[PDB]
Design a protein around this ligand. Structure first.
Ligand SMILES: CCCCC/C=C\C/C=C\C/C=C\C/C=C\CCCC(=O)O[C@H](COC(=O)CCCCCCCCCCCCCCCCC)COP(=O)(O)O[C@@H]1[C@H](O)[C@@H](O)[C@H](OP(=O)(O)O)[C@@H](O)[C@H]1O
Ligand SMILES: *[C@@H]1O[C@H](CO)[C@@H](O[C@@H]2O[C@H](CO)[C@@H](O[C@@H]3O[C@H](CO)[C@@H](O)[C@H](O[C@@H]4O[C@H](CO)[C@@H](O)[C@H](O)[C@@H]4O)[C@@H]3O)[C@H](O)[C@H]2NC(C)=O)[C@H](O)[C@H]1NC(C)=O
Ligand SMILES: *[C@@H]1O[C@H](CO)[C@@H](O[C@@H]2O[C@H](CO)[C@@H](O[C@@H]3O[C@H](CO)[C@@H](O)[C@H](O[C@@H]4O[C@H](CO)[C@@H](O)[C@H](O)[C@@H]4O)[C@@H]3O)[C@H](O)[C@H]2NC(C)=O)[C@H](O)[C@H]1NC(C)=O
Ligand SMILES: *[C@@H]1O[C@H](CO)[C@@H](O[C@@H]2O[C@H](CO)[C@@H](O)[C@H](O)[C@H]2NC(C)=O)[C@H](O)[C@H]1NC(C)=O
Ligand SMILES: [Mg+2]
Lengths: 340, 1064
């Protein structure tokens, strides 16, 4: 038996195997068991998404629709609010102009209940293609780290925003050039006997973004701001004009690009104390025009949940599978009796 | 004319004739490149990635590397090259076993025969091949150890004929007996050209002074074998691939399967799906970046033209969507088919322990063609028969005798005349006592077995005498007389001595004259002189010739033997009738002059001698009849019957004569006794038409019954088949061949064995298998879809040239029913799963073009997408393709009707292929739409107000698309071994531990830098472990509820056999 193959279980294709069958003793107790565990998770994740209470004010078209002299009422389509109570006074805006052409929208909403959990402030941008293939990679990851990268040693993903007049644009590319620059005021100013509610601007971004984004190492003689930054930095950069992107949390939040054309970006939060009920005001200076992208910039005042907001779409999907498996556990049971 | 000098190896080398090597390799060093590339670039996916990599070479298409597709295209071309180099080395090793065999060649300098190798033989050498070793080349015999110069070759490899051929030397050259006098002969041999007509040679050997003629009576071909002669002297005239038999054999051709032909039609299905999705995204890009050019100024788009932009993103959406066609499929179709052929040749039920040869699959690319076999084109001698004859039955004095009586008719029914079976012991008991009537007839029978023949006996040192018979039936008659008691011993000239073990005394018989065997006579007559001084005539021959020449008034048992000739032919045994008569000297003294009448006519001998002998066989007394069986191999009738239950039509193509092919078919039950054979034996072109027309007129004349189809058979001569394969009569022959249950072709040439198999695959869309042994059916094996050879015996030139080489014929049952139908369901399901799982990931790249303004941005990092078809979804195709048994081995052989699942094509077509894509489109839409609703604004997290970005969401798309395509495989599999439990749930557990290791170590090394905070924001989030639960179960609830409804309320025929397997 020199050339005879071995008599083992592997070579003779007789391995210890188990054969599943889809008997009604196995499939039908599975669908009843799936339905009785996907309903406590389905109702448990809809209650957690109902418990989130927020407020959204679309402050686009504050430039033309609002009143300069007095607080007038915001239309029905711009407000979307969810609260444990009812509101009595619907939200109001006002336009306020300063000494040189700089308007600030003054939203004046009402919070009908003490929101005992942590408050976060976002801005919702719609119809902004943060996930474009030309847009997602258009920066330079070495300038973010802080080292003085030279002009031809710089990245080529900055396709038109690489260098201006043979000088190095320091925040390079498209993601930094198109940064959102409506400055939300850092306090919810209380009106008529309610106290002010202070918000903070620190620890907004990811913790890996606060470690990678470091202060730059060029002196300002070599560099120049991006084209849409010239109104903020006229006459180029100086040594005291230089922005450190290590402490600039709004730069790190915007550069973390989003997946979808409707996205939030965190701007302000307070996690120490709760805001009591009352009439509040948020001053928003309007630098970023919506004609650039063609969507609706908005002001969102949210709370967090276990799934992170008022989104029913996870607890509903736990109820569709619990409804489908408990429907076909009935269709296949009346066929088991009346059609054997 | 091939002018061949006799005694100078430098002179014939100036002609530059062929060498002696025989290579059955597919490639060599001179054509490995234009032949391996042709069989790789006839697959349509390898043509697709060649024009995908040619699109990555124009400059500004896609920021992924220019050498990421053509790098993997060389990787899939290296793996498929090393497999076809591994197999072609194994074919070259088996050719080294033939060219390195020993062959004694003459030397002019040494003046004696030197031992050398087969490959050293040149045209013109004088060789000396010994007793029972095969002939090295096409040699003309010069001398032999026999006195006149004759020898006996066996041509069971170049034909199917079982008798021995009388090859004699010329008497003008048989005087060169001694090895020392071989140097003094000079001259040339004007030979013919290489042919393939075996029985015809024409040459002219001129010796020192004048020419001698040549003829096929002194032509010995390469596939022959010397027998019953000590040595011969031959002159090699054709060698290597220039012989008569191996001239039309070629290298192993490219053989594409029917599964592989469907994949080239599933690629075209997938390619016109591909052109649609590229055309949608490239029209939607040129519409959106023109109509919304005022709301996309933050991207700083160039906006060259509408034509130049459309022709640019037509290629960037080609490169993004090129991963629908998997490149990892065509390595795991070559490695599964190579690892299936290793498991076929590792089975002990296909191992032949007697000659120690296991089955080998030399061509691993055809292991799924064994699952759908419509026809089997067998061979007879060596394939179906053992080439061993044996004396089986005798019937004398109206009785009938065998040793091994079967219990179906052991009871002699005594229906008037005795019909039945009695033992050979009772034959000797009615021989011993003289009071019985049959005992003067029984010994007269039993001396005719041991004296009437022309066998030349020889003794050995052990004392066991070996008989040298020119025909194997006569040799079995002598051995049949020997174990009955009448042993045949020493034969001197003109007397025959017989040793009688009944009395113990050694007799002797004076042989007076024997008349030779003739196919026109089909008799053999032998007059003898006895110790009595009395003259008796012994005569053996067929029943159709001597039964006309009897005295029916003298003998009284003729009616019993003719019915005894009827049940012998119902078992396919070869028969001969035995007759005798006492004659006197006075008629013999004149009949000696009648023999001297034939001594006067040397000019006429075929006509004169034989009917001068028939002057004295005008009247005889019948002794009885004999029955010699041609032994079949083990399990031959049980696999002819079982393979016909599976719907496989079994043809038999042989080189034998017609009457012994019918006798074989009656014994393996290929032909029954209640069957209507349609014999077509014609000699002209139009009489083959007229015979074919009247058969096919008389078949549609009557309504075909459901049992009249199974009582119809066809028998073709090799001369009628040479006319019926012409393009005019090609269809009448094929329409009658489709009606009859079994076809038998006789006297068929080695090329006509191939022209039949070519004629069936041209006209029918069916798959054909050809099994044979010997080099007369190498062309039959190379022209079939699967070619099986018989190994373990000498002259195994068909076991080398084949794709599969088995031990014996009965291994064709398990190789087709069990290992074929497994290896069709395995490769068809593992291919459709590999097309599916590439769709269920790379279609989320298409539903994303509506949410990123038709830019083509990917949602996973390109390193992690490359790990999909390399790490986490490679093993569930391998376990399905190598270890999946959809129905057991003992139930595949109990129900041969389950072979019609693969035979129709019920597991692999384009229509089943569309359901694995539409399930892949459906599964990808659940992943996409399920995750853009959960990750609504990036606001699915609970970590201090921080959000989920692009890359923290595309990990949720990637991971959920892994649990689905691994959850689909866990419904597809039929059995769960330990190798399944590490492939389906061990690839998921591989990815869940690979990702917090990869994304925490590799971004620090500037590799996939997108993953900096992804592990904290995917794995640390509670919404990731909730999207991973419900979203697979959403997508796999339709595949699970249809699997229950299909097997319970609408089952196929194998779903019931699987339930028999589980519960019985
Ligand atoms: C864009 C260009 C492309 C255009 C292409 C269009 C058309 C193609 C042209 C012709 C198609 C031709 C025919 C298609 C029609 C039918 C396909 C043939 C039917 C077919 O065998 O396949 C089936 C797929 O079942 C669906 O059908 C799958 C049902 C799910 C379909 C749901 C519809 C999906 C639509 C896409 C959604 C997109 C939404 C858009 C979202 C946009 C987002 C912005 C196969 O799975 P199967 O579970 O039954 O397999 C069974 C069964 O699982 C098993 O128990 C049995 O074996 P065993 O017992 O031994 O194990 C055995 O019976 C086995 O076959
Ligand atoms: C989340 O919760 C609170 C939001 O209302 C906020 O704490 C309240 O706001 C301030 C911040 O501490 C407190 O008012 C000041 O308290 C300090 C304590 O000594 C006083 O010095 C200070 O007096 C004056 O403040 C002027 C500015 O308003 C300044 O110009 C003067 O020089 C002088 O210092 C105020 O009286 C208030 O009592 C806090 N209330 C409660 C209930 O905590 C949290 O800081 C906030 N957390 C965040 C944003 O991280
Ligand atoms: C907040 O963010 C806003 C959007 O990112 C930004 O608005 C853009 O600001 C830039 C610069 O102020 C505007 O660009 C101007 O374009 C006009 C054409 O209409 C030009 O006259 C001018 O470019 C000039 O370029 C010359 C060379 O060709 C050169 O002599 C000068 O350097 C000069 O820059 C302006 O640059 C742009 O139109 C604004 N709108 C949009 C929709 O992009 C706000 O400025 C920014 N505000 C703050 C306070 O940060
Ligand atoms: C808490 O809120 C108060 C109310 O706005 C902040 O007080 C302001 O501080 C700025 C800084 O100079 C002054 O210009 C304003 O006039 C102050 N407002 C009032 C009403 O006094 C205070 O700074 C906040 N606390 C922190 C730590 O920022
Ligand atoms: Mg044969």
């Amino acid at each position: 038996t020199s050339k005879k193959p071995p008599n083992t279980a592997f070579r003779q294709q007789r391995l210890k195997a188990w054969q599943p069958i889809l008997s009604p003793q196995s499939v039908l107790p599975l669908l009843i068991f799936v339905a009785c565990i996907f309903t406590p998770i389905g109702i448990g994740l809809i209650v957690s998404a109902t418990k989130v209470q927020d407020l959204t004010i679309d402050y686009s078209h504050c430039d033309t629709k609002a009143s300069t002299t007095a607080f007038e009422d915001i239309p029905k389509k711009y407000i979307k609010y969810h609260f444990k109570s009812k509101v009595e006074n619907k939200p109001q805006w006002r336009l306020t102009e300063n000494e040189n052409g700089e308007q600030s929208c003054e939203l004046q909403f009402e919070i009908p209940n003490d929101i005992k959990k942590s408050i976060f402030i976002y801005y919702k941008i719609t119809n902004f293609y943060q996930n474009h293939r030309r847009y997602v990679q258009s920066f330079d990851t070495k300038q973010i780290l802080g080292e003085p990268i030279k002009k031809d040693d710089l990245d080529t993903s900055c396709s038109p925003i690489r260098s201006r007049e043979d000088k190095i644009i320091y925040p390079c590319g498209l993601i930094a050039n198109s940064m959102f620059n409506d400055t939300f005021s850092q306090v919810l100013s209380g009106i008529d006997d309610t106290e002010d509610y202070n918000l903070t601007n620190k620890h907004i971004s990811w913790s890996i973004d606060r470690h990678r984004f470091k202060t730059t190492k060029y002196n300002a003689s070599d560099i120049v701001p991006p084209p849409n930054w010239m109104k903020k930095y006229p006459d180029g950069y100086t040594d005291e004009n230089l922005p450190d992107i290590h402490t600039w949390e709004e730069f790190q939040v915007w550069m973390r690009t989003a997946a979808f054309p409707k996205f939030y970006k965190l701007t302000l939060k307070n996690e120490s104390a709760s805001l009591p009920k009352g009439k509040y005001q948020m001053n928003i200076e309007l630098n970023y025009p919506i004609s650039l992208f063609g969507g609706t910039k908005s002001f969102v005042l949210t709370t967090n949940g276990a799934i992170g907001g008022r989104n029913m779409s996870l607890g509903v999907l736990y109820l569709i599978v619990a409804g489908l498996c408990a429907l076909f556990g009935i269709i296949f049971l009346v066929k088991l009796i009346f059609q054997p | 004319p091939r002018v061949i000098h006799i005694n100078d190896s430098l002179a014939n080398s100036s002609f530059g004739y062929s060498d002696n090597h025989i290579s059955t390799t597919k490639y060599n060093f001179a054509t490995f490149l234009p032949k391996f590339l042709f069989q790789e670039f006839s697959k349509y996916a390898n043509l697709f990635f060649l024009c995908t990599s040619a699109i990555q070479q124009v400059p500004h298409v896609s920021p992924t590397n220019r050498y990421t597709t053509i790098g993997t295209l060389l990787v899939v071309l290296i793996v498929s090259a090393m497999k076809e180099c591994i197999e072609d080395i194994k074919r070259a090793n088996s050719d080294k076993e033939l060219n390195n065999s020993t062959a004694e060649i003459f030397s002019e300098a040494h003046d004696d025969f030197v031992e050398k190798r087969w490959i050293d033989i040149r045209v013109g050498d004088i060789i000396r091949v010994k007793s029972e070793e095969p002939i090295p080349a096409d040699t003309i015999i010069l001398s032999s150890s026999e006195p006149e110069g004759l020898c006996y070759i066996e041509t069971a490899n170049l034909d199917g004929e079982t008798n021995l051929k009388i090859k004699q030397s010329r008497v003008e050259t048989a005087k060169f007996i001694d090895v020392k006098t071989l140097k003094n002969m000079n001259g040339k041999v004007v030979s013919e050209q290489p042919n393939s007509s075996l029985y015809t040679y024409e040459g002219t050997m001129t010796l020192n002074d004048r020419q001698i003629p040549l003829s096929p009576d002194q032509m010995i071909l390469r596939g022959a074998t010397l027998r019953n002669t000590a040595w011969i002297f031959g002159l090699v005239i054709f060698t290597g691939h220039e012989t008569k038999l191996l001239r039309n054999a070629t290298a192993t051709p490219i053989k594409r399967t029917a599964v592989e032909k469907i994949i080239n039609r599933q690629i075209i299905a997938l390619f016109t799906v591909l052109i649609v999705l590229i055309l949608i995204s490239s029209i939607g890009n040129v519409i959106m970046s023109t109509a919304d050019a005022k709301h996309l100024s933050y991207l700083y788009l160039e906006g060259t033209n509408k034509a130049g932009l459309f022709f640019k993103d037509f290629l960037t959406f080609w490169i993004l969507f090129s991963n629908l066609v998997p490149i990892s499929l065509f390595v795991t179709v070559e490695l599964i088919k190579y690892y299936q052929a290793f498991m076929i040749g590792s089975d002990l039920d296909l191992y032949y322990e007697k000659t120690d040869t296991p089955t080998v699959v030399r061509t691993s690319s055809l292991v799924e063609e064994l699952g759908q076999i419509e026809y089997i084109f067998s061979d007879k001698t060596g394939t179906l028969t053992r080439n061993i004859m044996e004396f089986k039955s005798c019937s004398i004095a109206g009785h009938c005798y065998i040793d091994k009586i079967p219990e179906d008719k052991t009871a002699t029914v005594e229906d008037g005349i005795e019909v039945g079976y009695r033992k050979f012991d009772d034959l000797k008991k009615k021989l011993n006592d003289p009071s019985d009537e049959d005992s003067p007839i029984i010994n007269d029978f039993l001396t005719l077995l041991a004296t009437c023949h022309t066998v030349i006996p020889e003794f050995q040192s052990d004392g066991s005498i070996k008989y040298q018979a020119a025909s194997p039936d006569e040799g079995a008659l002598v051995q049949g007389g020997a174990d009955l008691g009448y042993k045949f011993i020493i034969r001197k000239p003109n007397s025959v001595t017989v040793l009688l073990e009944e009395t113990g005394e050694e007799k002797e018989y004076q042989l007076l004259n024997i008349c030779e065997f003739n196919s026109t006579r089909k008799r053999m007559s032998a007059i003898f002189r006895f110790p009595d001084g009395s003259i008796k005539l012994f005569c053996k021959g067929a029943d159709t010739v001597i039964l006309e020449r009897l005295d029916d008034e003298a003998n009284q048992y003729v009616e019993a033997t003719m019915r005894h000739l009827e049940d012998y032919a119902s078992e396919g045994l070869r028969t001969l009738c035995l007759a005798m008569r006492d004659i006197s000297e006075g008629e013999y003294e004149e009949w000696n002059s009648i023999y001297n009448e034939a001594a006067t006519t040397l000019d006429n001998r075929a006509e004169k001698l034989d009917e001068a002998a028939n002057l004295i066989e005008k009247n005889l007394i019948l002794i009885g009849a004999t029955a010699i069986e041609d032994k079949l191999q083990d399990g031959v009738p049980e696999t002819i019957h079982t393979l016909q239950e599976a719907g496989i039509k079994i043809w038999v193509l042989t080189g034998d004569r017609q009457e012994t092919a019918i006798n074989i078919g009656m014994s393996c039950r290929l032909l029954s006794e209640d069957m209507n054979l349609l014999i077509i034996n014609e000699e002209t072109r139009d009489d083959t038409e007229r015979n074919l027309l009247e058969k096919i007129n008389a078949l549609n004349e009557h309504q075909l019954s459901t049992h009249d189809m199974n009582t119809l058979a066809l028998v073709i001569d090799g001369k009628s088949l040479g006319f019926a394969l012409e393009p005019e009569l090609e269809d009448y022959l094929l329409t009658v061949a489709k009606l009859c249950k079994a076809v038998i072709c006789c006297r068929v040439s080695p090329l006509q064995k191939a022209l039949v198999v070519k004629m069936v695959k041209r006209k029918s869309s069916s798959l054909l298998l050809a099994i044979g042994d010997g080099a007369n059916d190498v062309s039959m094996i190379q022209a079939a879809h699967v070619g099986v050879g018989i190994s373990g015996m000498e002259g195994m030139q068909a076991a080398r040239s084949a794709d599969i080489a088995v031990g014996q014929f009965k291994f064709l049952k398990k190789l087709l029913l069990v290992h074929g139908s497994w290896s069709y369901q395995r490769i068809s399901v593992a291919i459709l799963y590999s097309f599916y799982k590439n769709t269920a990931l790379y279609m989320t790249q298409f539903w994303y073009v509506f949410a990123n303004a038709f830019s083509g941005q990917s949602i996973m990092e390109s390193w992690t997408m490359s790990f999909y078809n390399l790490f986490f979804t490679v093993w569930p195709p391998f376990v399905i393709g190598v270890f999946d048994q959809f129905v057991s081995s003992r139930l595949l052989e109990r129900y041969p009707q389950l072979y019609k699942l693969g035979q129709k094509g019920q597991f692999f077509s384009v229509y089943i292929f569309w359901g694995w894509i539409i399930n892949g489109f459906f599964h990808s839409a659940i992943v996409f739409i399920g995750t853009i609703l959960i990750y609504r604004y990036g606001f699915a997290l609970n970590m201090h107000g921080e959000l989920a970005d692009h890359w923290s969401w595309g990990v949720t798309v990637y991971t959920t698309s892994v649990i689905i395509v691994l959850g689909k495989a866990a419904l597809v599999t039929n059995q769960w071994t330990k190798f399944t439990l590490i492939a389906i749930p061990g690839s998921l557990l591989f990815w869940l531990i690979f990702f917090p290791i990869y994304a925490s170590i590799f971004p620090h090394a500037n590799i996939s830098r997108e993953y900096y905070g992804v592990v904290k924001h995917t794995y640390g989030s509670g919404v990731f472990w909730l999207t991973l639960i419900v979203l697979p179960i959403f997508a796999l609830v339709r595949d699970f509820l249809w699997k229950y409804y299909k097997r319970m309320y609408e089952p196929e025929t194998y779903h019931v056999i699987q339930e028999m397997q589980k519960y019985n």
